[PDB]
Amino acid sequence: DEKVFTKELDQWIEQLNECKQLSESQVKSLCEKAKEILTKESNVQEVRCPVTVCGDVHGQFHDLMELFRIGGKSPDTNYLFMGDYVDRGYYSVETVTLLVALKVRYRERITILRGNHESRQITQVYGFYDECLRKYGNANVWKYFTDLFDYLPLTALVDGQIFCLHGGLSPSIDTLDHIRALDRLQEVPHEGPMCDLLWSDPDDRGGWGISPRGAGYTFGQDISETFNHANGLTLVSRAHQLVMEGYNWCHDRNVVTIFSAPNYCYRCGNQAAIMELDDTLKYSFLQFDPAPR
Amino acid sequence: VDDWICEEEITGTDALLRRMLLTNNAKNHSPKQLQEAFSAVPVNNTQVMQIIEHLTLLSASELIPYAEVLTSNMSQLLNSGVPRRILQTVNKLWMVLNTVMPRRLWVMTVNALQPSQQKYTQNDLMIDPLIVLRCDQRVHRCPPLMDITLHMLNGYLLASKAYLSAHLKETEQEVTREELKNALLAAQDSAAVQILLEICLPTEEEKNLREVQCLICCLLHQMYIADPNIAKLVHFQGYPCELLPLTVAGIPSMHICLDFIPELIAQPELEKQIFAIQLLSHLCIQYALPKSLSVARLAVNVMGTLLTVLTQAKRYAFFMPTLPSLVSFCRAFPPLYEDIMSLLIQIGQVCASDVATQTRDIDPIITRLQGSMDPDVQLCHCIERTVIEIINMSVSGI
Amino acid sequence: EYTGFQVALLNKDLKPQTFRNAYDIPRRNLLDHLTRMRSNLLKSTRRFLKGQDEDQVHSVPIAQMGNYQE
Amino acid sequence: GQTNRRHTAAVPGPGGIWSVFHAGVIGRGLKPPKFVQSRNQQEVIYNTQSLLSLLV
Ligand SMILES: [Mn+2]
Ligand SMILES: [Mn+2]
């Protein structure tokens, strides 16, 4: 049973890498195994060094393939994706299918987090629902992928020292034990700890503030310093805003923005970047251009 | 200047007298003869000692052809059991060959003292001179080979200065480039100093050392009198405190180190302030001057001011490594006693107040009779031990 | 050092320029940084930079940088 | 219950006249090797017995 599913899933990886969509029953089985493998995973999953952390993909599949050509193939280099790989891109189902199949194939080598775009309402309004209707035909595969987004872990921890999440901090979160105590098994609300986890963003302020997004908050250097000191952390990695250079060290070498989708929405022209934590926590930046088409 | 000054006439042309009366027939010795003398499968040190002792008397121009065999066979001269004349006389022959063929000798000696292989050229050594400090582990406790390494490192540091100046001058096709080269040279010399000082540490396996320590002290004194900016940069960077006696007792140039202790103690960084306090204390032990006493009074005032302004954890981190320096200050200068004493009593009771803030596992307040503990009781114990040390210093101080 | 001495406090808006001055390099990475400095003076590229990490300040706009291209 | 010498001895290959591979260190390095606590339950239960006897 393990051998036949392993070789079938490897053929699924090979068929995904050449940009071919799967079938509905194959997505059914992939999503069911993904549900089984993601049930036994905490809100703060400890990812051991080394790991190559990548940021937002947002359904740019050829850019994802280039990313695998830069940082290394998925069997050989560890990856940690901070969500938001589903909307604002032409090839959306292939990207999420490749990530989920790589997760269920390599359970210690691919870590997948949850973004704010990976919810029912946002996928319904910003494009994944339409892509679902135009390729697979009905809205049922969107139902499996929304449940799969529902089970995804929120944050991740690298060697007890680097905190990786999609959005930003929270006025209601003070310790990492509160992250592990949240009920993750629900769609992201309009108010609460987890909406702020997936929606907040840093800014050069002196305190909290209403984010110009309709949800989440915004935080400054004092808040980030307090969170890093009170939790034994030294770095907060996140991927929520478009960056030209692909990386930002804001809040005085404490908060790191890593955007990994070059030419966002195919009209912005940003040079994306990813971070490569070695076995000595001894990092480097891989900065790349969009793929030829 | 050392290479040219070892060429000068020493006393009475005794070397000329020896080359007149002892090398009548030395044509039997050959470079290849020394080659199989070294490369015997047992270690017959007698015949190689014969050949090298006869090789002392020759002139440098006549000693040119033996550079190949000597340099290629330096690497065997590191095993446990070589006699000391072999090392010392190979050092003497290397010093003789340094007067004539220095650049080829250095680039040949790098490729031989490396650990056991990369063949290195002069351009790589002028670009980076720190491969000289990347020699074998056994070189670190062989005094003649370390002396060779130190002369080689000084030569390649000056070489890198000239090379960076020339490469900057050629590639113009300007102030920013010049200051960048200045910063590179300064950080380069500081890195060389720090690596030498870390060689001066005792190794963890043992926990000949003194010879390496004093040779490195000689090289550092020469580099400090060459330019004081390297000394200021290194003492701003810092080195472990166990080197603080050795660096102060052994390098006379540290006297000008009393010029920037006010500047070093004014830096916002805290561990720089502990380093400044400790370095000032060892200097006041070494050099007892009115300048040293004035900077000592400034140090006492700075410690009092930081006692006014410090958080408890930072107070422990600042006052734990300092307090022996107060013993040094009190030992150097009597007129500071009561001032020193005042600081102690103040720090004592403020730490005592901190002990009353929370419950403790040892309760030291009621212990007025005589591991991993609470930091506050450790600080109180450090205060009482430094008072014990001050009192026993005063009693036995005559 | 007599009635005119003030210990300097840490400034958040310091911007420690690690290539312009040897005083700003910490010990624990010093040799690392030294090699990087050497690489700069041996790069001989079209543009020479005096800072290792110049990411951005507050905002990264698409329109501001997209105007500086053809 | 609840440096520089060893740094420069091992910097061959990736350096030379070319820049080093990395961009820096995130913190001070690896976060220790992590401590493993070890107890024996008989001493735990009987010191607890002694304290509860004193309290009662
Ligand atoms: Mn996205
Ligand atoms: Mn997002």
Q: Measure the CA–CA gap between B110 and B71, rounded to whole angstroms.
A: 9
User: What spacing in Å lies between the alpha carbon of C32 and ligand 2's midpoint?
Assistant: 35
Tokens of residue B55, six digits: 């090789």
With CB atoms and an 8 Å threshold, state whether D4 touches B118.
no
C12 touches chain A (CB under 8 A): yes
- Torsion, Cα B375 B376 B380 B383, to 10 degrees, reads 60
Enter the CATH code of domain A6-288: 3.60.21.10
C13 alpha carbon to ligand 1 midpoint, in Å? 33
Among D26, D28, D34, the strongest candidate for a mutation testing the A interface, having the largest count of A CBs within 10 A, is D26
Q: How far apart (Å, rounded) are the C-alpha atoms in residues A105 and A125?
A: 31
Distance CA A213, CA B229 (A): 54
Per the CB < 8 A criterion, the answer to whether B73 and B113 are in contact is no
- Contact between A270 and A242 (Cβ < 8 Å): yes
Q: Is D24 on the interface with C (CB under 8 A)?
A: yes
Q: Does B124 touch chain D (CB under 8 A)?
A: yes
User: Token pair for residue A127?
Assistant: 């494009």
Helix (H) and strand (E) counts for chain A?
10, 14
Q: How far apart are CA B222 and CA B234, in angstroms?
A: 15
**Tokens in use for C9?**
């406090």
Distances (CA, A) of B121 to A248, B111, B118, B170, D17: 41, 9, 10, 21, 13
Amino acid in position A37: I
The structure tokens listed for B115 are 């650990």
Distance CA(B66)–CA(B100), nearest Å, equals: 13
Resolution in angstrom units: 4.1
Listed residue (A168, A136, A146, A289) closest to A240, CA to CA: A168
For residue B365, which of B379, B380, B378 has the smallest C-alpha distance? Answer: B380
Q: Which residues contact A74 (CB under 8 A, 6 or more apart)?
A: A13, A68, A102, A106, A109, A110
- Among residues A117, A178, A190, A229, the one annotated as catalytic is A117
Given a contact cutoff of 8 angstroms between Cβ atoms, the answer to whether A27 and A97 are in contact is: yes
Going by C-alpha positions, the residue among A198, A195, A184 that lies closest to residue A152 is A184
Residue A160 near chain D (CB below 8 Å) = yes
CB B325 within 8 A of CB B278: yes
φ, ψ of residue A163 in degrees (nearest 5): -105, 120
- The H-or-E segment that residue C33 falls in is helix C30-43
- Spell out the long-range contacts of B86-92 with Cβ–Cβ below 8 A and sequence spacing 24 or more: B86/B45, B86/B48, B86/B49, B86/B52, B87/B142, B87/B143, B87/B144, B87/B145, B88/B144, B89/B49, B89/B52, B89/B53, B89/B55, B89/B56, B90/B52, B90/B144, B91/B144, B91/B145, B91/B147, B91/B148, B92/B56
Q: Structure tokens of A100?
A: 């989920």
Ramachandran region of residue B320, left (φ > 0), alpha (ψ -120 to 50) or beta?
Answer: alpha
The reply to whether residue C31 touches residue D25, judged by beta carbons under 8 angstroms, is no
CA distance C31 to A68: 32
Q: How far is Cα A120 from Cα A141, in angstroms, rounded to an integer?
A: 12
Element (H, E) at B378: helix B375-396
Q: Do A245 and C56 touch (CB under 8 A)?
A: yes
How are beta strands A255-258 and A235-238 bridged, if at all? Answer: parallel
Instruction: State the DSSP code for A74.
Output: T
| Dist. CA B132–CA B152, nearest whole Å | 7
* Chain B residues near residue C44 by CB distance under 8 angstroms: 171
Question: In whole angstroms, what is the distance from residue B285 CA to residue B325 CA?
Answer: 10
For residues A97 and B391, give the distance between their C-alpha atoms in angstroms, rounded to a whole number: 77
**Solving technique for this entry?**
cryo-EM
- Tell me how close the Cα of A242 comes to any Cα of chain D, in angstroms: 22
The span from the CA of B263 to the CA of A119, in Å, is: 58
> Both ends of chain B: CA-CA distance in Å?
46
- Beta strands A155-158 and A162-164 are antiparallel
The token duo for B117 is 């292989």
Rounded distance between C-alpha atoms, residue A166 and residue A156, angstroms: 10
Task: List the A79-81 sheet strands across, edge first.
Answer: A110-112, A79-81, A51-54, A272-277, A285-288
**How far apart are the C-alpha atoms of A140 and A145, rounded to whole Å?**
9
- Distance of alpha carbon A59 from alpha carbon D46, whole angstroms: 62
- Distance (angstroms) between ligand 1 centre and the Cα of A276 equals 21
Alpha-carbon span A201 to B329, nearest angstrom: 53
Burial A253-274 (b: 16+ CB within 10 A, else e): ebbbbbbbbbbbeeebebbbbb
Q: How far lies B27's CA from each of B17, B30, B70, D5, in Å?
A: 19, 7, 18, 45
Which candidate, B2, B15, B181, places its Cα nearest to that of B95? Answer: B2
- Could you tell me the residue ranges of all domains in chain A? 6-288
Element (H, E) at C66: helix C62-66
What is the C-alpha to C-alpha distance for residues A22 and A8, in angstroms, rounded to an integer? 12
Calpha distance A152→A38 (Å, rounded)? 7
**Mutation choice for D interface testing from B132, B167, B195 by most D CBs within 10 A:** B195
Residue A178 catalytic? no
Cα(A262) to centroid of ligand 2, in Å? 15
Structure tokens at B156: 């390649």
